Amino acid sequence: PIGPPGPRGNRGERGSEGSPGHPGMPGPPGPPGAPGP
């Protein structure tokens, strides 16, 4: 009579961390310039 099945294998390694996200949105237009001379 055949022997019992063998034990289950080990878990695979965790998947690697993902890529970084896209860079941010460009910022707001700057302040208004000072009045002229």
Add this chain to the structure above:
Amino acid sequence: IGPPGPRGNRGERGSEGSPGHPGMPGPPGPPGAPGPC
């Protein structure tokens, strides 16, 4: 005797990876409107 039993089951696959780090900040916005007279 008894032949050896069956090969065990395939281990469960590892857990899926983490979401990536956030991306870098976006560039500074453009210059402001030219000032008045």
Add this chain to the structure above:
Amino acid sequence: GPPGPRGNRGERGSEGSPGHPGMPGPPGPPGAPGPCC
């Protein structure tokens, strides 16, 4: 009946998803001084 062999190690988990975009960029430089009317 002897136990069977250990199953193979499970597969590697898949690569995690990309992260969030970066934060919006800083404001720009003040605008140029006004012209000399």
